[PDB]
Every structure is written in C-alpha cells, then in structure tokens.
Design an enzyme around this catalytic site. Structure first.
Site, mmCIF file in Angstrom:
data_model
loop_
_atom_site.group_PDB
_atom_site.id
_atom_site.type_symbol
_atom_site.label_atom_id
_atom_site.label_comp_id
_atom_site.label_asym_id
_atom_site.label_seq_id
_atom_site.Cartn_x
_atom_site.Cartn_y
_atom_site.Cartn_z
ATOM 1 N N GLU A 197 0.852 -1.201 0.000
ATOM 2 C CA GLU A 197 0.000 0.000 0.000
ATOM 3 C C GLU A 197 0.880 1.241 0.000
ATOM 4 O OE1 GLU A 197 -2.375 0.222 3.562
ATOM 5 O OE2 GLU A 197 -2.947 2.326 3.209
ATOM 6 N N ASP A 199 0.681 5.130 0.783
ATOM 7 C CA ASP A 199 -0.189 6.243 1.207
ATOM 8 C C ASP A 199 0.385 7.561 0.692
ATOM 9 O OD1 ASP A 199 -2.081 4.595 2.537
ATOM 10 O OD2 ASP A 199 -0.611 4.315 4.107
ATOM 11 N N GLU A 202 -2.381 11.251 3.437
ATOM 12 C CA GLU A 202 -3.202 11.068 4.645
ATOM 13 C C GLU A 202 -3.089 12.420 5.382
ATOM 14 O OE1 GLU A 202 -1.595 7.018 5.740
ATOM 15 O OE2 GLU A 202 -3.742 6.832 6.230
#
Ligand SMILES: *[C@@H]1O[C@H](CO)[C@@H](O)[C@H](O)[C@H]1NC(C)=O
Ligand SMILES: *[C@@H]1O[C@H](CO)[C@@H](O)[C@H](O)[C@H]1NC(C)=O
Length: 398
Positions: A197, A199, A202
């Site tokens: 994953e 990111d 965020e």
C-alpha cells in the site's frame, strides 16, 4: 456477493495524463464505492438480515461455504451516490464525511477505467502523481486519504463474484483486516486481506503525512494467525514522512505563517524517482500554492539524516523496521510497477483519535481534540474535495 437488481450509477470523473511535450490530456474515469458499503442483504425467501460486519467472517447459517454465500447474499447497486456523500462535478470529486441530515457515510471509493469493468491501473515508478485539494474543512482527528493498494484489476471477477470492479470488490491494504467478503467471496475462514500500500496522502488542515507500506507478498494475500499481525507479512506502520515528526513546525498549517497555508486550496505533487534500471529510490513531495512552487522541507532532527525526500536511509534511521524487512523502497517500487489501484476516502477514529497523524510528535492537535465529539464542535460537516487528478512524466503535471 451476487449483484441484486438495483442499478449501479457511477459518478464520472475527468482525469488527466501528462507529458512534457503534449501537456495534460483529459481521460474518462468513473468512481465506485467499496463493495461492502453497498447494501448487502439475504436473498428473497430467506429471513431478513445481513451477511456480516467489518471484522468478522460472514454468518454460518447463510454462508457455510463459498458457493452458498454467493447465492444467499445479495449486493444491491447504488443508483444515487450523493446519498453516500460522493458527488463529482467535472474534474472534482467531493467526499462528505457527514451529510446535512446527520448520516455519516464516511465513503471510500476507487477509480474505475473508462469501461467501468476494470480499475484504472497506475504504474507510477519513475513518474509523478499530482492533484489539487481543498482541506479547509478538516480539523484535528479527520483523515482525508488518497492512496494506492495492490488490488486485482477486475476486482477478482470470477464465477462466484460476477460483480467485480463494477461493484468495488477486491479491497486490500497493509493492515490485513478481516472482512466478511474478500475478493467478492465469503471469507469463511476469517482470513485478513493484505497487500502492498502506498499512502500518497493522509492529511487534514493541521498535519500532512506520506507513507509507503511494504508487504513480502505480491497482490492480495489472505493471511491467517500471526501472518496478519505486526510481525507478519505487511508493514502496518509504514515509513512515515511528516514535517512535524522531523522537527519542522512551520511548514504546513492553518494560516499565513505556514509555508503551505491550509486555509486555501493547494496542489500536491509526489514524484517516484527511479534509477535507470527502473528501481524506485526516492519519494519526493512538494506543493504548489497561488502559482508558487513550495519546495520540500529538509529534516531538522538529531539522529535523522539530512534529506528532503523519503529513502531507505531515512526509513531505517527513523525505525521503520518492518518496512525495511518486507522489501524496503525497492519492494514498494516493484508493487508500483506491477500496477496499483487508486483509492480515496474520508474517515475519523473513535478508538484512537487519529493521534499518529496530527498529535504529539506528529502535529499541533491536543490530547482529546481529535475525538469525534470534539471534531463536530469545530466543523460539523467535515469534507474534502480532490480536483484535477493527473499523472505522467516527471515535471509535467504542474
Ligand atoms: C463544475 O465543473 C465545471 C468543470 O470543471 C466547472 O467549470 C464549474 O465551475 C464547476 N461548478 C462548481 C459549482 O464547482
Ligand atoms: C528541533 O529544532 C529546533 C530548532 O528549530 C532545535 O533547537 C532542536 O534541537 C531540534 N530538536 C531535535 C531533537 O533535533
């Protein structure tokens, strides 16, 4: 689950593909809500009820095995996405966490390609991804997220999961959570849904975090027992990059005294810099606001290498141990080269107040400020708007 009769009407979104010579050209994309946010009920003839909640295997009465689960559990289409806080207008995607009538849909959506039957696959190693954001309605405790997960391109469309990407099946991420359906199949054994994953974003108006999370598996991996835990196959913590954690406190925040002023819209640029052999070496974030490039900050903390980009050295020195063991920057880059799906969401955290994002070492939010009952005293209807999603050649998106 088995698609019901209600029709699915996907919001359309225009996005761009950019090159230094051709500029940014438009492309047609569609938005789909996560499959488990669609109304899921028992088949007609069965008593009323559902097919499980987040965190658990589906029910033993209607889902004793995969085949029964696939016929007893019905997933309806969503004919109006605005009821889930998702609307689009031209090149903008608006996500509302809380609607004016009090519902809290907290939507998570994925980007479909032009056919609506496959996710748009992004291959970002050596390229750049950029979007415009309005984060003003996001106080402490809120997380507006924009990230990539190594999901299957058709959502693992199969005999028992005919809906596929068209209904948003196939979610996975580095937390390896247990969901009642995984790849559109009843999760009889209660396994976790794991995958690499990245990111990209965020953030809220008070703190901004970036973090790659590696796993030592390719694609969606169904974990069991200790494989799902902290010492398992995925890096739960990730290698985090937040100006506050590296002791730069005036870079991002609400107001004119911050370099990136979150009281106004701004542009977020992320470059995945690879060597000539195609291996990811560094991740670089910088912003654009009011037509001015705002370069990245450099770390400013004892014990941390002086650098303005994420890399193996920075990750190892800040204690991202699982990141380094499950593949490091090169392994993140390989997932990015294989192809990842774009996910966008907005959420809050009743259990922990999102403290790792914007409290203590991570930002200016006080203890207790990020609780849901305090968020709504500051902003009763938190929401985020993402505009002009665009990716392509280094230097061509801004
Ligand atoms: C709706 O989208 C179009 C195309 O981007 C834009 O010109 C217009 O200003 C948008 N309207 C609102 C209310 O944002
Ligand atoms: C954090 O930065 C300040 C200067 O802005 C400096 O005085 C302090 O030593 C730094 N702290 C660490 C732990 O590096």
């Amino acid at each position: 689950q088995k698609p019901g009769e209600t029709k699915e009407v996907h919001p359309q979104l225009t996005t761009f593909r950019c090159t230094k010579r051709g500029g940014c050209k438009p492309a047609t994309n569609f938005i789909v809500l996560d499959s488990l946010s669609h109304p899921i009920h028992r088949a007609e003839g069965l008593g009323p009820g559902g097919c499980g909640d987040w965190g658990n295997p589906p029910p033993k009465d209607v889902c004793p095995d995969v085949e029964s689960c696939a016929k007893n559990c019905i997933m309806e289409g969503i004919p109006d996405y605005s009821q889930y806080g998702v609307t689009t207008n031209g090149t903008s995607l608006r996500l509302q966490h809380i609607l004016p009538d009090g519902r809290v849909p907290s939507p998570r959506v994925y980007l479909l390609d032009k056919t609506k039957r496959r996710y748009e696959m992004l291959h970002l190693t050596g390229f750049e991804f950029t979007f415009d954001v309005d984060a003003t309605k996001l106080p402490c405790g809120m997380n507006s997220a924009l990230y990539l997960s190594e999901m299957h391109p058709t959502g693992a469309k199969s005999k028992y999961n005919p809906g596929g990407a068209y209904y948003g099946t196939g979610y996975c991420d580095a937390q390896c959570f247990v969901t009642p359906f995984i790849n559109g199949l009843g999760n009889i054994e209660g396994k976790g849904s794991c995958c690499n994953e990245m990111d990209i974003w965020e953030a809220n108006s008070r703190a901004s975090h970036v973090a790659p999370h590696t796993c030592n598996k390719k694609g969606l991996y169904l974990c069991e027992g200790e494989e799902c835990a902290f010492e398992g196959v995925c890096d739960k913590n990730g290698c985090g990059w937040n100006n506050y954690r590296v002791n730069v406190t005036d870079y991002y925040g609400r107001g004119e005294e911050f370099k990136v002023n979150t009281l106004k819209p701004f542009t977020v640029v992320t470059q995945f810099l690879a060597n000539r052999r195609g291996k990811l070496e560094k991740i670089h974030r910088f912003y654009v606001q009011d037509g001015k490039v705002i370069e990245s900050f450099y770390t400013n903390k004892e014990g941390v290498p002086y650098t303005n980009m994420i890399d193996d050295e920075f990750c190892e020195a800040t204690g991202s141990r699982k990141y380094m063991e499950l593949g490091a920057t090169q392994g993140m880059g390989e997932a990015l080269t294989r192809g990842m799906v774009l996910a966008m969401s907005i959420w809050w955290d009743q259990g922990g107040n999102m403290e790792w994002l914007d409290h203590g070492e991570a930002g200016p939010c006080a203890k207790g400020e990020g609780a849901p009952s305090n968020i709504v005293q500051v902003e009763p209807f938190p929401e985020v708007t993402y505009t002009n999603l665009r990716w392509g050649e280094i230097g061509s998106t801004y």
